[PDB]
Chain length 302, copies 2
């Protein structure tokens, strides 16, 4: 099928230091899958007739100094190019490239080579690997079950080569609690960590089907990042100037709406380019003994 | 100009117990104004060249037991009808009617008579009265200044009769700190109130131009409503079953991002239909001596 190109003028509901851009990306992923896989994702049902949610599982937003999510303001003209890749019947990979409108070569199609091996400073690259799930019991957000809706057309979707498997990426992150190997050269682990008790925010972070909202995981990760930033005695003003050039998230689990989660954060500082840091956040559900999320942010600051 | 009809399938980014639906409504308001007033609202500039924001000022969402914002789930098919009304060059009123797709008479055009005098149980009615503003100083969110972009075409927009003026509605609400007169019969003021210190949430509630995000005022109002609900010894589970059949909001001010706000809430219980309440929330900026928001929610609960 054709990739979907769209002209987008940045709206209030898709930018700022919160989770709105990630929220908008997610809506585009469900639109792109519905179009390319001949399925209404929004109203999807399993063969048995139960609601099946195309759940976010691995999420990457890669930018750079020249274009990062914090670059976007009201009225900016963007080019968005979207398309899906075959991951079988139970999962699907969606990519989005975001360029400034009118920018040289913004009409170019998706290029796996570009996304996984030659990402350009000035374009934003979004990877959404999603897994169809159902609840195992009504009103439980635990122990979700793999699924697929009838008529899900992954067939003919372009193929991903072995090298570019998001499954390798997330499997290492669940084991290491980072997406950037602790043995990666030119970085030094600061000793300062934080651990924040976070009750599920029922006012803010519940979605339309009673799960924790996928974009709320980015909010909870930045809550932990702020906690750690303040512990480094740095200013709220400076927090809002942070440049996030890369962010990876794995959604290991969801959680019941009466849960108390734990947000853990650590940081590694560059020993090679000043102000550049790696922040790792782990979200736990202590009462169930589950790690429900891992995130790593590649940041630049002052 | 033509009113804009659109078929909408409910997405994750526009429903749930949070502020997403209000966020989506606001984006539709800026799209509708851009279309009908021949102006790019998203990138708007005053004649001098400074950014001008079409700021939310009065916001009403009216539903009923048969269709309220909490009715909306992923994949619901809606009909949205949108259009603007002349309020001069510095302000504009936008209306949205939301019906279930296929519902009897969902093709009907906007009807001021219907919105202000004969609202139907089963349709949602949204009123957004917006005022063009600029900052008075860079990086200040206080003392915003009335404005208008060059080429703003309010001319020919359909007219609003004197009876249906939102200015009368908001002027009374800034004076009384409710949209439902304290002398309204069949209600009784409970004695239980709350007052919550709320630092501006820089992780969550900042928009793409560094103001407090308009939808975050609905989040802060429900934070106060939850505080009061818990004081009435009621359950978080019951909070998520609340039905909001009507909500009015006035944005009296914005606030600097280092502000500590105060959220005050009181409730009146019906003495005529059980479980029906009026909740009033006032948001203050004590340090500047300003009331920055008033909201009243007409609720039904168990
Ligand atoms: C659209 C949406 C959304 O997707 N929210 C949910 C965000 N994502 C999640 O909650 C996914 C959480 N992940 C899981 O529940 C599990 O990792 C799951 C995908 C079921 C795989 O389960 P498990 O690791 O036990 O593996 P098995 O399949 O059992 O082997 N929303 O609006 O919030
Ligand atoms: C789109 C958006 C948004 O609109 N956010 C801002 C939400 N709304 C506001 O902040 C409006 C706050 N209101 C005001 O600043 C004032 O009431 C204002 C409209 C300037 C009128 O000022 P004032 O009451 O001092 O009246 P004068 O014109 O001075 O008489 N956003 O994405 O967050």
């Amino acid at each position: 099928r054709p990739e979907i190109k769209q002209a987008v003028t940045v709206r209030p509901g898709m930018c700022g230091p919160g989770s709105l851009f990630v929220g908008q990306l997610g809506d585009w992923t469900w639109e792109t899958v519905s179009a390319q896989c001949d399925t209404d994702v929004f109203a999807a049902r399993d063969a048995s007739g139960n609601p099946t949610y195309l759940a976010f599982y691995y999420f990457r937003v890669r930018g750079g100094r020249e274009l990062h999510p914090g670059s976007l303001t009201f009225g900016d003209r963007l080019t968005v190019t979207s398309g899906c890749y075959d991951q079988g019947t139970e999962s699907v990979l969606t990519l989005h490239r975001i360029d400034r409108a009118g920018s040289d070569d913004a009409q170019r199609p998706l290029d796996l080579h570009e996304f996984y091996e030659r990402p350009r400073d000035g374009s934003l690259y979004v990877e959404n690997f999603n897994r169809w799930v159902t609840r195992s019991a009504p009103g439980s957000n635990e122990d979700l079950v793999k699924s697929s809706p009838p008529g899900f057309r992954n067939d003919g979707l372009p193929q991903l080569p072995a090298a570019y498997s998001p499954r390798a990426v997330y499997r290492e992150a669940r084991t290491a609690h980072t997406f950037r190997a602790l043995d990666e050269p030119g970085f030094r682990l600061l000793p300062d960590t934080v651990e924040v008790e976070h009750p599920v925010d029922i006012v803010r972070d519940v979605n339309g089907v009673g799960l924790l909202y996928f974009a709320s995981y980015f909010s909870m990760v930045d809550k932990a990042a702020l906690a750690l930033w303040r512990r480094l005695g740095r200013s709220d003003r400076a927090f809002l100037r942070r440049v996030v050039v890369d962010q990876q998230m794995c959604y290991l689990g969801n959680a019941d709406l009466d849960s108390v989660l734990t947000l853990g954060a650590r940081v590694r500082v560059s020993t090679e380019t000043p102000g550049e840091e790696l922040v790792d956040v782990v979200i736990s559900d202590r009462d169930s003994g589950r790690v429900i999320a891992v995130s790593t942010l590649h940041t630049q600051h002052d």
